[PDB]
Each structure stands twice: as C-alpha cells, then as structure tokens.
C-alpha cells in the first residue's frame, strides 16, 4: 500500500511488475475542477481538496472527441482511438515513480498529440513503466481537452477565450512544481516531451511566459507550433465558432448568450458539428486549435520565435522519415493501406487539391514542378511517393527543422534526429514506411519488453534510445557514453547536422531535406 500526500490530499498508487522489478503507477490523480455545466469552455479552474484517500489505480476517463472509423476493427488505425470513457470530466494524470522511491529523480511530462481534437494519455504507446523501471525517471501524462470544448475561442471573453486545452496541461505542470517532491521527483529538473500536437504544445510551453518556471527541457517529435496545421488564425477562429453556433441553432448577437446556448449542449451534438465548421477542409483538419488569445500566447509565435522571445534552454527536436503517408489513406485518391497505391500523375494532382484546398492553381503546379524532377521517368511509385514527400515536407520535417535553427540562433544547444527504422509488428503497409507516431513506442521502451514480437536489433535501438533521452532530460545531453556509440552533435544553423535513428548504423548527416525545405520556407509562403 504506497500512499502520497499531496496538497490537495492523499492519493493510494499501485504497484507494477516491469523487467523483474517494481514499479509504483498513480493512475488519474485528478488535477483540475472537472469543466463542467457553466465551467465548460472556461479556463481550468484550482482542484478543493478532499481529506479521503484518492484511488488513483486506473486511467480516468478520456475527454469527449470524435473517432477515427475509416478502418474499423485495424489495429494499425484503432491504437490511437481513446480506450477509456468520454467524458468531459477528464482533467486527470498519471504519474509512474520508480520503485524504491527515488530521492531527487528527474521528471519526463508527456503531451500527447491528436491534430488537438483527439488523444488520450492512457493509450498503450504512452506507458510510462518502462521509463520509470529502466532510467530511474519519473514519468507524468495528463489529459487535456481537445476541439471545440479544448480550443473554441472568442478572444477577449473569457467564456470562451480558446486555448483551454494548454491551460489544462499549464495547470498539470503546475501540479507537479507543487507535488512532485512528495512522489521523489525533482520539480527543477522537468522535461516536457510530446509527438504532433503534443510536440506543438510543447514547443507553445516555450513562448508562453506563464510556462517559463514549470519545466527545464524540451523534447519535440514530429511537431512545432510553426507548422502549418499547428495555430488557428483569429480570423479562422471566429469564422468557426460562428460556424459552429449556426449548425447548432446557437446563433445570437450577444458573444456571451452564444456560449451560454452551447453550454445547454449536450458533447455529443457538439462533436457531430464540429467537422463542418471547416468548410474546405484537409484531411483530418485542425479544426479548433491554439489561437493567439493575449494570455497564453501574447502575439504571432512566428514573430515570437523570430524575435528570440522564448525561454532560453536545451532542445531536442527530430522527425521520421515518411511523415506523410499516414495522411494520404484518408483521402487521397487511388490510395489504400490493402494495395500498393501507385498513382498516376492525375491522381497526384487530385490529391494536392485534397492536401491544399484553399491553394491557387499556381501554387499547386508550383508544388507539382518541385517533385516530379525524376531521376528516373518510368518508376511506377514516383507520384506516390511524390505526395507523401509533400506533405510530410510540408507539415512536419520543414517546419521542425525551421524551428530548430531559429531556435538555436540564440544560442541554445539543440539537437535534432531523423527516425528512419520501420517497426517489424507494424501493421501498416510497407509503402507507408516510417510512419507518422511510429518512434513513439520506441521513445517508452516497448521493444525492451522481449514478451511482444519486436526483433533484438529493435530492443537495442530502443534502449539506446531511451537512453539517450533520459540523458537529455537529466543532463541537456543525448549521448549514450557507455557502449561507443555515434555522438550526437549540436545542431548549428550553419553546419545543421543531426542524427540518424535505425537499426543498423547510426550517422550523423548534413542538411535534411535542404532542396525540398528552402522550396516550403523561402517559396511556398509567398503563393
Ligand atoms: O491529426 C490531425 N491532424 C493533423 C495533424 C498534424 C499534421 C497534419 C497534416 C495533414 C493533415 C492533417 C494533420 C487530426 C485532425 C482531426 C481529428 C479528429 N477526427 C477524429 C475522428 C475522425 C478523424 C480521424 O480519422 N482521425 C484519426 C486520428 C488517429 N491518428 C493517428 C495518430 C498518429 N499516427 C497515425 C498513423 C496512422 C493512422 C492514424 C494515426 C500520430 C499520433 C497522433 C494520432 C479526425 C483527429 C486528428
Ligand atoms: C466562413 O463561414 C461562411 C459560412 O459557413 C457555412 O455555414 C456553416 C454553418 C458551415 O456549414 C460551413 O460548412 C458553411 O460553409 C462560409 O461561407 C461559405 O463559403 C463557401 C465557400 O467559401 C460557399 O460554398 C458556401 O456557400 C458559403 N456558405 C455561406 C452560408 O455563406 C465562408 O466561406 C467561411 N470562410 C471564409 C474565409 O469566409
Ligand atoms: C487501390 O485501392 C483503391 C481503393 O479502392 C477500394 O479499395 C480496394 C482495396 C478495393 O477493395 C476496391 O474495390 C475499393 O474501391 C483504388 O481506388 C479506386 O480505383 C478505382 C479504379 O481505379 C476507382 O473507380 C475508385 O473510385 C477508386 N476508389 C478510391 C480512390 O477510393 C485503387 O485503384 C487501387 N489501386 C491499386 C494499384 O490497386
Ligand atoms: C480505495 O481502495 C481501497 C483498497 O482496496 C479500498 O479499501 C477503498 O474502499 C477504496 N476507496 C474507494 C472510495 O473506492
Ligand atoms: C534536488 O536537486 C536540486 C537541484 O537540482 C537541489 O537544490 C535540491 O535540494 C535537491 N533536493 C533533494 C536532494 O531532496
Ligand atoms: C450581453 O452583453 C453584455 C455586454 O454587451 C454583457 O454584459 C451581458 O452579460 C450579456 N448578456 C448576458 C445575459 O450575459
Ligand atoms: C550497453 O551495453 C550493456 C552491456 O554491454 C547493456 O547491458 C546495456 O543495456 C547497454 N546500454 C545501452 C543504453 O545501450
Ligand atoms: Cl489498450
Ligand atoms: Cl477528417
Ligand atoms: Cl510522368
Ligand atoms: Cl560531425
Ligand atoms: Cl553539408
Ligand atoms: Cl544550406
Ligand atoms: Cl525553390
């Protein structure tokens, strides 16, 4: 019976058998007043202490979200679907400690990704143990609201003041600054690590000055706040919380009598809404998302970020190789995960208009001209390929590497990676590649544990890379000194190297994507 008193009162964890030892797992410690009734779309409100003994022993609800239905019963599509309760009470973390409790153990914060309308801390991938078990760190998830009830914004008016959801993680990072000393965490050595959206957030934590003193470190995978998907325009915003109150009959001329009619809603009629507030939208748009709402966010991030206006501290940033291709089997046309999905060049051109809908014919046959320069003609896979490039370059590997050398022009270290090893369990097809979340499993250790079906090279790149990242989150180094292996070099946005993540040699390597990226950064802006 390990028992904590936090401040708010005491909580009972349970206790974990990991790789022949013991790990202690708080599971859904709640953290906030649940946002509910005249709470709901409201900033996080502080928790009232109770004077019992909490239960924390079982992931607590998920937050309400629509789910993915393209793949019914595919375990490739249904991993990442929330497998606890809906609920709007949601606003609970989890804490793994090592066993015995540590003195002064370094803490790893988790933030999932999900596009900002999806996610859930307590999915497989995110499980904490490993990391608790072999690197002697403390590991800290939370539940954050996504979509309209997580991001819908009137700015200025607090019933609705968008970026609720980064409220929600701020106050779990606050919760452990004021608790974690009592599980044996160190409240001065805390990393923030999070994929996708989650990565987004956190590189978001680095602007926000209400963030600045919660955390030490950062660790971006596949996610930054400049992507293009990553921040919804105060125009966009307002045309979508309009959009929103029209399909649900809650149009009114009073700002405030509006948020009060979506207050009556019940989630459900919520969710089913929120889909068509983008007209022309993207595969799995972003459809309410972090927005520049004076508060947690005080201007533009990119001039934020242009201007060095962020906390001054160690990165660690990185992306895998086929980003893209995730994206492309819902939607694009002539693609499937059951075929191999070549493409002619039509149906390329169908899917930029897919990918870019609001884009102009030139911008669109400005991409096209960019990426059918082949070396061959006749290679049957060239559009297909061609598209996942696109939008992997487009979304993810360009933006994560234009925030890295902005980043480290003020002088902060940083180190990026490219993760290029496709899982032997992954249940995708092979032409997908190195897909969009698959480090994930990597980066919490679940190739450690022989019982699943991953190969031995893969339990080596996993353990190094945990390694590594427990040595960044510690130490703002991600060496691995023990076993000669390949040291990670700083990322200077002159030589700009970084380091390759797979199972058989580990290099260093110049200028990722440098042809494709000066395309999306120094080009594409303009059109
Ligand atoms: O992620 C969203 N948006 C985007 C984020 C970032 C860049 C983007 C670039 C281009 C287009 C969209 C982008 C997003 C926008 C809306 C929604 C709400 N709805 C949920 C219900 C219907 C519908 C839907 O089926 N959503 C699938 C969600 C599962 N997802 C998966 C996850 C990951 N990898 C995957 C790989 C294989 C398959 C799936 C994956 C990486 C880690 C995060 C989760 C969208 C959700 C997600
Ligand atoms: C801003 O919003 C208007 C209105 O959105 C429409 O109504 C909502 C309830 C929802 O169902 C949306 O999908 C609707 O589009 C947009 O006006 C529409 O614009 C499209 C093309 O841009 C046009 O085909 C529709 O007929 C228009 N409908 C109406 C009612 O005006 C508008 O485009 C949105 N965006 C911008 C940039 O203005
Ligand atoms: C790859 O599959 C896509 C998707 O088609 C669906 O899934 C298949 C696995 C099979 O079960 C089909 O019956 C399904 O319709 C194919 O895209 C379709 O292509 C046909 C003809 O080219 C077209 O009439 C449909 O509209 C397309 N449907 C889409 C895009 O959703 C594609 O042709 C297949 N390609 C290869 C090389 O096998
Ligand atoms: C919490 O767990 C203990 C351990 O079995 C149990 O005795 C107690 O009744 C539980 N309390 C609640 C409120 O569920
Ligand atoms: C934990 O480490 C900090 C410095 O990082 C130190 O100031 C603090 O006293 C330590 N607390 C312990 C060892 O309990
Ligand atoms: C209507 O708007 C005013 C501000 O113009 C606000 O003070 C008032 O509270 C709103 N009505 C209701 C019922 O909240
Ligand atoms: C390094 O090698 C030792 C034995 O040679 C092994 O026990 C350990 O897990 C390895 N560690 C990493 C981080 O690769
Ligand atoms: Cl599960
Ligand atoms: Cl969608
Ligand atoms: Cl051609
Ligand atoms: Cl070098
Ligand atoms: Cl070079
Ligand atoms: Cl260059
Ligand atoms: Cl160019």
Not at 129 to 143: D, G
Not at 203 to 228: E, M, V, Y
Not at 364 to 388: C, M
Not at 494 to 515: D, G, H, P, V
Request: glycine letters at 8%; aromatic letters at 14%.
């Amino acid at each position: 019976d390990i028992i904590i008193a936090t401040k708010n009162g005491k909580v009972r964890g349970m206790q974990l058998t990991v790789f022949g030892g013991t790990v202690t797992a708080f599971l859904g410690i709640p953290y906030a007043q649940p946002p509910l009734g005249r709470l709901r779309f409201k900033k996080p409100q502080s928790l009232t202490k109770w004077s019992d003994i909490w239960n924390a022993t079982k992931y607590a609800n998920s937050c309400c979200q629509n789910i993915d239905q393209s793949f019914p019963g595919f375990h490739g599509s249904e991993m990442w679907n929330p497998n606890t309760d809906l609920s709007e009470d949601c606003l609970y973390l989890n804490v793994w400690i090592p066993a015995p409790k540590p003195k002064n153990a370094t803490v790893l914060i988790w933030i999932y990704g999900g596009g900002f309308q999806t996610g859930t801390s307590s999915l497989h991938v995110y499980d904490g143990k490993f990391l608790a078990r072999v690197e002697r760190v403390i590991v800290v998830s939370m539940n954050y609201r996504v979509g309209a009830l997580g991001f819908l914004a009137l700015p200025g008016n607090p019933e609705a003041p968008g970026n609720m959801g980064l409220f929600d993680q701020q106050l779990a990072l606050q919760w452990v600054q004021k608790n974690i000393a009592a599980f044996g965490g160190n409240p001065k050595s805390v990393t923030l690590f999070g994929e996708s959206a989650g990565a987004a957030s956190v590189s978001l934590h680095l602007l926000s000055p209400g963030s600045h003193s919660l955390f030490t470190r950062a660790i971006l995978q596949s996610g930054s706040f400049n992507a293009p998907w990553a921040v919804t325009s105060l125009y966009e915003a307002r045309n979508r919380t309009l959009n929103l109150a029209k399909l649900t009959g809650c149009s009114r001329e009073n700002e405030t009598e509006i948020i009060k009619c979506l207050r009556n809603k019940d989630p459900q009629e919520i969710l089913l809404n929120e889909a068509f507030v983008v007209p022309y939208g993207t595969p799995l748009s972003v459809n309410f998302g972090p927005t520049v709402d004076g508060d947690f966010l005080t201007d533009m991030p990119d001039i934020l970020l242009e201007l060095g206006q962020f906390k001054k501290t160690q990165i660690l940033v990185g992306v895998n190789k086929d980003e893209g291709t995730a994206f492309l089997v819902y939607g694009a046309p002539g693609f499937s995960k059951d075929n191999n999905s070549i493409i002619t060049r039509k149906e390329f051109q169908e899917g930029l208009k897919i990918f870019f809908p609001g884009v102009s014919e030139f911008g669109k046959e400005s991409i096209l001209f960019h990426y059918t320069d082949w070396v061959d003609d006749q290679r049957p896979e060239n559009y297909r390929e061609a598209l996942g490039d696109v939008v992997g370059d487009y979304n993810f590997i360009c933006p994560a590497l234009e925030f890295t050398k902005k980043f480290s022009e003020w002088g902060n270290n940083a180190f990026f990676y490219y993760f290029e090893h496709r899982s032997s369990k992954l249940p995708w097809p092979e032409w997908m590649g190195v897909m969009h979340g698959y480090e994930i499993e990597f980066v919490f250790g679940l190739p450690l544990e022989r019982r699943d079906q991953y190969t031995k090279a893969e339990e080596i790149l996993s353990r190094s890379i945990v390694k590594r990242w427990a040595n960044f989150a510690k130490y703002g180094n991600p060496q691995e000194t023990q076993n000669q292996s390949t040291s990670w070099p700083v990322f200077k946005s002159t030589e700009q190297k970084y380091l390759t993540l797979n199972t058989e040699s580990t290099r260093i390597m110049t200028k990722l994507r440098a042809q494709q990226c000066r395309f999306w950064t120094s080009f594409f802006p303009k059109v």
